[PDB]
Design a protein around this ligand. Structure first.
Ligand SMILES: Nc1ncnc2c1ncn2[C@@H]1O[C@H](COP(=O)(O)OP(=O)(O)OP(=O)(O)O)[C@@H](O)[C@H]1O
Ligand SMILES: Nc1ncnc2c1ncn2[C@@H]1O[C@H](COP(=O)(O)OP(=O)(O)OP(=O)(O)O)[C@@H](O)[C@H]1O
Ligand SMILES: Nc1ncnc2c1ncn2[C@@H]1O[C@H](COP(=O)(O)OP(=O)(O)O)[C@@H](O)[C@H]1O
Ligand SMILES: [Mg+2]
Ligand SMILES: [Mg+2]
Lengths: 50, 440, 278, 352, 219
């Protein structure tokens, strides 16, 4: 799921920059966003358990 | 809940006797105890009486430090009564009015302001104290500081204060800002006043003051139309209308500024309305100038300066001049602006009549060199006042817009429609004539 | 006779007297959320010649989820105020109705009205009422609710990618939602609205106190720095109680004492854990 | 007079009713789309001498039975349930009958009454006045008494409802009634909506439950969207009283819906003394009555128990066949009620 | 909210009809007027004194309470081990009083659908109010009056809602002064505090297991 989502996020970042091609920096930012939000969800679940 | 009226009435005179004898400290201690009891009981009248009497006793002793400390302490006393604090502040304001020494007055006023800062019940008192402090600062010779102090206030919000007082405060703020040379701030402040106010019962002096301040503000940078409107408002006041000289000056200013204002629909309407006034007869020359600027014919700057040059600039004892075209730099600038207005009027008329003119002829008719006329026309075209096209190689100025085939055909159609309507009207008139002259 | 496109009972936003009064400026911070929301339902309306070039497909809807009181409905009101497209506001609890068929009929009518008014936004608040994951299929009530949800899914999938009809849905409990809603083609943009951090707290405090009087002695940085997990509603309530104390004491200026007391009143700390731990 | 009445009856017999419907849209000058409350939608005409500018999309209308022509436009309907809510009778309780609650009265008034009399202060400060309050505390502390006092002594419109009574068996009717209640408040601004015993429908929203549970949560979601949603309420206030603030949704307790959480705790010594004075005033008492002893013996009591002390003292007097009460009777009553209190669990819960 | 008979075709009001109450609420009323004198109860003298002086006396001799300026007791709860003479005393009170009596049972108020229980409770109180001075007897109160707890199990919440409606009817907005209440419970440790309050169930009468003299009198 994370690998699928990072691709779409990189595409959207390329869209915002307004170019028809995805970039390595776009992929880096996409991973930084998706993995961080997944970690946020995990820690939220941990707090709910607490 | 527990009245102390009898106790306060019985005690206060004794405290006054002791205070005048010289028992200040003991009397203040006892009155403070009584005030504590009254505040706990929630006795508004008793607390107010105690506070006012204590302040009066401290005042009639020339104990200024004691007065200040007592006022601060009694204001900060826990669960104090707002009405009691208001009464104390009112009495202290009377005392501040009476006092004369400058630093003592300053310190007392500062303490009162610090006490009454941010409090709805005592806000008119703070406004009056701030006005007095600003007046004192200005008299001492700090106009910038007085303007800042008076501007810090926000009088449009105080719901308890009366409209007359609010308008007076706003006008004072405007005057101080103009004296400190802050025109943006002056305009922002002046926006507060509602012109509908100067119509109710007595808004005559305030109306005149406000309109004069607005005249100054606009005249700073040149707002001739608004200046004319302000002068019309001044001229409308019955106080000015009663005296012949005042209304005469007002009408002179109105006409002159309407002349000076650039051309537009509002300016034309104002000029027509001003001309349609019977009182103008008493100002004959100015009426002639208005007619000159309203008639659609060429006018000459030399002729205008020859005829009205002295009457509108130096004046005569029978009809005094006006500061519109004085000998100062403002008057010189206004004279130059009037010349520019004459040139613009000439250009507009020679555009209403004339499809094509030569640059030499336009300069000869505007009384300017070819280069100056070219610059004037170019500025007008760029500003979009009039339409013109300069063919520099041939020296021709074309005042007619391009004619599209749609435009030509539309003109032809309009002519045909007008012809048909005229035929119908002629037939109606013919029928009427035949009816009138045929039966007999 | 064939009547005009819609008679309808699900009325459209009058957008002249029912238009909210919440600006974008009235909201403080949430720049990322504003970007995402105004991108997922205005960017496809614009452009679209970049969206396929990179192989990603435009999102049909947006799901706003977060704790209770961090700007969801406020942002919805802001977009309604500042958008020229037609607005169709609904609440999930409205779909469920006594008579069978009425719920699906209402969903269909809503989406048909949105289709008829070409650029339109459909906003369903508290979608948890309809999109609950669990269900007891031997009641009839639950069966009708499931029918409403299925009809909503069918309508949302039945889009041709050529009509500017976007759907926004706000839910405080995003875990309880049926995965079908999150399936691609349906809601695709999940925007989080978390409790403000230090910077968002500072911006919210500034934007809410810019209207109050706020005597100079008040330093909002001390309250921003405090490590309390509070929402924008909490911040607004802090300011509101400070103003209430000012009014009670009969002052038109707010003081640091009032702000401190309001913070204590509104951010009431939970029961303290005993010290023999730690 | 008898013949006048008979003629009026005969004339009134020959009169037919009119279908009641809602106007959805105006197609042309003489064509409207109308939805009869039954369910069907008709294209109908309009009577000529009728102000058609007043037939907006939602106006109630009376339709002729035969031709279905629009013959009258009527004000928005008020459900009999909402009428009954508005037409309750909370006696004539006055603020003097409440003892020990001064700060709480001040706060509740600041929320409900002050913004409805002096909006200028709030405008000057720069804050929108708060909307809702939550009266929580042990039983018998005075929440419903405070609500009754507000309703009796204040001049705004009042809507009293019980959350248990809001619920209905059919699907969606609870939410429908909440919507109708808030529409009534919006129309008759200013209004106070008092939802007593809120925890009946306002509870933590679970993930695993039942159909009835989900129906109640849908009702709660409708209520929340009404209190704070796409449409602001402006001049409608809310009061809610609960003995169990802990079992409430964070969304409902959020400081945008229930701004103030007022705590009505068990009375202190002074509160007990004031309540005893209030409830023992009207009794015919012979001899000195030392309320301090009763207060000292009535620790842990609530207002209802302090009233029951007076009631039991009067009952002891009636048993003795006396036309007056005495301190001995009061002491016996306080001992009796103290003994009775043992059968109750003394515990309070907070909004956490 | 009234009930009116109207013409079938003209839809014109022709007659105002008596109010409508649920069939269950109507069955709750007592028509046979049981016959059990106070003498048939042996061993309970303090408890009978309390019950009569709290229920019957206010209805007949209201002048005493009005003169003394004290409100009559509101509600009587009877609790004790089973077989101690609670329903018997309720029957005796119904027999000796000639005011309206509404017999009721705890489980009678728990209903399948949501809101039906509260509807029944409010309809019963409405009927009691309509029919002059009246007495409502809620036996097996523990069926609906159980303590409120924060539990994830449904079903209990419906009976809790019915209990909240009953609490409001007993004491709340719109005070009631014409319908009394008698309640009998085998258990008081499980009853909710809001139901055992002093404004709803004021007089909590304990019914102990009989002593030697009580046993002799019963035999
Ligand atoms: N950034 C912000 N700036 C200003 N006010 C804010 C901000 N964030 C939240 N608020 C406050 O949020 C309150 C309304 O909350 P909002 O409508 O966003 O709720 P919500 O998150 O949709 O609620 P729920 O999660 O219960 O559905 C407004 O009073 C506003 O004061
Ligand atoms: N004190 C008593 N004197 C005479 N008969 C008694 C007494 N106590 C109980 N009985 C007899 O008990 C029989 C049944 O008692 P009843 O059902 O009324 O008691 P209860 O306390 O209401 O019971 P439970 O707790 O089981 O509901 C009746 O026939 C009654 O004669
Ligand atoms: N503080 C109080 N002052 C006077 N009477 C009180 C007080 N608290 C409770 N009562 C009594 O309780 C009854 C109302 O109960 P109330 O306390 O308003 O609701 P709740 O018991 O749900 O908090 C009234 O009959 C009143 O006599
Ligand atoms: Mg929301
Ligand atoms: Mg029994």
């Amino acid at each position: 799921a994370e690998v699928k989502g990072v691709c779409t996020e990189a595409g959207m970042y390329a869209l915002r920059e307004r170019r028809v091609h995805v970039t390595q920096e776009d992929f880096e930012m996409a991973v930084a966003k998706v993995m961080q939000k997944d970690s946020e969800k995990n820690m939220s679940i941990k707090k709910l358990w607490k | 809940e527990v009245d102390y009226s009898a106790t306060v009435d019985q005690r206060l005179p004794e405290c006054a006797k002791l205070a005048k004898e010289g028992r200040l400290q003991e009397v203040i201690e006892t009155l403070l105890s009584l005030e504590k009891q009254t505040r706990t009981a929630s006795d508004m009248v008793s607390t107010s009486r105690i506070l006012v009497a204590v302040v009066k006793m401290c005042y009639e002793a020339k104990e200024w430090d004691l007065l200040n400390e007592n006022i601060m302490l009694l204001s900060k006393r826990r669960s104090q009564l707002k009405q009691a604090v208001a009464k104390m502040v009112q009495q202290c304001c009377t005392y501040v009015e009476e006092i004369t020494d400058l630093p003592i007055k300053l310190r007392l006023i500062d303490t009162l302001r610090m006490v009454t800062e941010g409090k709805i019940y005592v806000e008119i008192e703070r406004a009056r104290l701030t006005k007095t402090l600003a007046t004192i600062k200005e008299q001492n010779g700090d106009v910038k500081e007085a303007a800042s102090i008076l501007q810090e206030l926000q009088v449009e919000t105080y719901g308890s204060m009366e409209k007359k007082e609010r308008v007076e405060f706003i006008l004072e703020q405007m005057r101080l800002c103009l004296a400190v040379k802050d025109y943006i701030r002056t305009q922002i402040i002046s926006k507060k006043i509602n012109t509908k106010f100067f119509q109710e019962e007595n808004t005559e002096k305030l109306k005149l003051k406000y309109y004069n301040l607005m005249i100054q503000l606009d005249q700073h940078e040149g707002s001739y139309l608004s200046i004319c409107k302000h002068y019309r408002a001044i001229y409308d006041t019955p106080c000015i209308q009663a005296e012949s000289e005042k209304w005469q000056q007002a009408l002179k200013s109105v006409v002159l500024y309407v002349i000076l204002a650039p051309f537009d629909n509002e300016q034309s309407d104002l000029v027509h309305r001003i001309s349609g006034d019977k009182k103008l007869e008493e100002i004959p020359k100015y009426k002639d100038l208005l007619k000159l600027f309203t008639t659609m014919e060429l006018m000459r700057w030399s002729t205008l300066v020859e005829d009205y040059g002295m009457e509108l600039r130096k004046g005569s004892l029978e009809s005094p001049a006006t500061d519109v075209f004085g000998s100062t730099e403002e008057g010189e600038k206004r004279w130059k602006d009037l010349k520019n207005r004459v040139v613009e009027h000439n250009i507009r008329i020679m555009a209403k009549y004339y499809t094509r003119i030569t640059m030499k002829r336009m300069a000869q008719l505007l009384d300017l060199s070819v280069d100056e006329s070219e610059a004037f026309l170019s500025n007008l075209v760029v500003n979009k006042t009039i339409f013109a096209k300069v063919d520099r190689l041939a020296g021709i100025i074309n005042f007619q817009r391009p004619k599209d085939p749609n435009n030509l055909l539309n003109d032809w159609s309009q002519k045909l429609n007008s012809l048909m309507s005229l035929v119908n009207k002629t037939t109606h008139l013919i029928a009427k004539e035949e009816m009138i002259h045929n039966l007999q | 006779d064939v009547l005009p496109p819609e008679a309808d009972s699900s009325i459209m936003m009058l957008t002249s007297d029912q238009k909210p009064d919440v600006m974008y400026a009235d909201i403080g911070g949430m720049d990322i959320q504003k970007q995402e929301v105004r991108e997922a339902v205005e960017l496809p309306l614009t452009h679209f010649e970049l969206y396929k070039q990179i192989g990603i497909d435009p999102p049909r809807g947006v799901l706003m989820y977060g704790p209770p009181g961090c700007g969801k409905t406020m942002l919805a009101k802001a977009v309604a105020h500042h958008t020229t497209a037609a607005f169709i506001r609904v609440v999930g609890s409205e779909f469920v109705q006594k008579y069978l068929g009425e719920g699906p009929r209402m969903v269909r009518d809503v989406f048909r009205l949105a289709k008829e008014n070409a650029p339109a936004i459909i906003f369903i608040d508290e979608i948890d009422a309809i999109a609950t994951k669990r269900f007891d299929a031997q009641t009839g009530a639950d069966r009708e609710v499931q029918r409403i949800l299925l009809e909503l899914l069918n309508q949302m999938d039945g889009f041709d990618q050529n009509v500017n009809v976007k759907v926004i849905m706000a839910t405080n409990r995003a875990d309880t939602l049926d995965p079908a809603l999150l399936r691609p083609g349906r809601l695709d943009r999940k925007i989080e609205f978390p409790l403000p951090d230090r910077r968002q707290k500072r911006l919210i405090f500034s934007t809410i106190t810019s209207k109050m009087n706020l005597s100079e002695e008040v330093d909002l940085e001390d309250y921003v720095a405090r490590p309390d997990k509070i929402s924008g509603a909490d911040i607004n309530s802090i300011c509101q109680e400070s103003g209430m104390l000012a009014v009670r004491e009969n002052r038109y200026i707010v003081l640091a004492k009032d702000f401190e007391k309001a913070y204590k009143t509104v951010i009431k700390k939970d029961e303290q854990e005993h010290e023999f731990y730690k | 007079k008898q013949y006048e009445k008979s003629e009026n009856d005969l004339k009134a017999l020959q009169s037919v009713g009119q279908i009641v419907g809602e106007v959805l849209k105006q197609l042309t000058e003489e064509k409207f789309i109308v939805k009869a409350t039954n369910g069907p939608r008709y294209v109908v005409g309009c009577r000529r001498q009728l102000d058609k500018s007043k037939l907006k999309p939602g106006t109630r209308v009376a339709l002729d039975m035969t031709t279905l022509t629009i013959m009258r436009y009527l004000p928005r309907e008020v459900d009999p349930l909402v009428y009954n809510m508005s037409h309750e009778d909370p006696g004539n309780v006055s603020y003097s009958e409440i003892g020990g609650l001064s700060e709480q009265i001040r706060e509740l008034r600041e929320v409900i009454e002050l913004p409805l009399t002096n909006p200028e202060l709030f405008q000057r400060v720069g804050i929108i006045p708060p909307k809702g309050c939550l009266l929580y505390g042990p039983p018998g502390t005075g929440k419903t008494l405070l609500a009754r006092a507000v309703a009796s002594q204040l001049d705004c419109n009042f809507l009293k409802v019980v959350s248990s009574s809001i619920v209905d068996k059919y699907i969606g009717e609870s939410a429908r009634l909440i919507r109708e209640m808030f529409n009534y408040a919006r129309d008759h601004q200013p209004c106070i909506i008092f939802m007593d015993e809120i925890d009946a429908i306002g509870g933590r929203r679970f993930s695993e439950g039942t159909s009835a549970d989900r129906e109640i949560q849908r009702t709660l979601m409708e209520l929340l969207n009404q209190m704070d949603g796409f449409d602001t309420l402006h001049r409608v206030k809310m009061i809610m009283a609960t003995n169990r603030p802990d079992t409430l949704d964070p969304a409902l307790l959020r400081p945008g819906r229930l701004d103030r959480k007022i705590h009505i705790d068990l009375p202190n010594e002074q509160a007990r003394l004031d309540i005893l004075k209030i409830h023992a005033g009207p009794i015919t008492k012979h001899g000195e009555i030392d309320y301090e002893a009763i207060v000292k013996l009535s620790d842990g009591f609530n207002g209802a128990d302090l009233r029951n002390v007076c009631t039991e003292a009067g009952m002891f007097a009636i048993r003795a066949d006396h036309d007056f009460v005495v301190q001995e009777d009061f002491m016996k009553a306080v001992r009796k009620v103290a003994d009775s209190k043992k059968l109750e669990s003394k515990l309070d819960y907070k909004p956490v | 909210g009234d009930l009116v008979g109207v013409n079938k075709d003209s839809y014109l009001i022709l007659e105002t009809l008596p109010t409508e109450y649920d069939s269950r609420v109507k069955a709750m009323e007592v028509d046979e007027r049981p016959t059990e004198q106070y003498s048939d109860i042996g061993g309970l003298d303090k408890q009978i004194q309390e019950l009569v002086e709290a229920i019957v006396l206010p209805m007949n001799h209201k002048e005493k309470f009005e003169n003394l300026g004290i409100q009559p007791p509101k509600g009587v709860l009877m609790y004790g081990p089973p077989g101690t003479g609670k329903t018997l005393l309720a029957r005796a009170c119904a027999a000796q009083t000639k005011a309206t009596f509404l017999k009721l049972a705890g489980p009678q108020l728990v209903q399948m659908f949501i809101g039906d229980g509260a509807k029944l409770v409010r309809d019963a109180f409405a009927l009691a109010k309509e029919k002059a001075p009246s007495i409502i007897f809620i036996d097996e109160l523990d069926a609906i009056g159980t303590k409120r707890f924060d539990s994830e199990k449904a079903g209990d919440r419906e009976v809790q809602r019915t209990m909240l409606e009953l609490l409001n009817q007993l004491d709340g907005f719109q005070p009631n002064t014409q319908v009394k209440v008698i309640a009998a419970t085998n258990r008081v440790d499980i009853l909710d505090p809001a139901l055992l309050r002093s404004g709803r169930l004021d007089r909590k009468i304990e019914f102990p297991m009989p002593n030697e003299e009580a046993r002799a009198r019963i035999m």
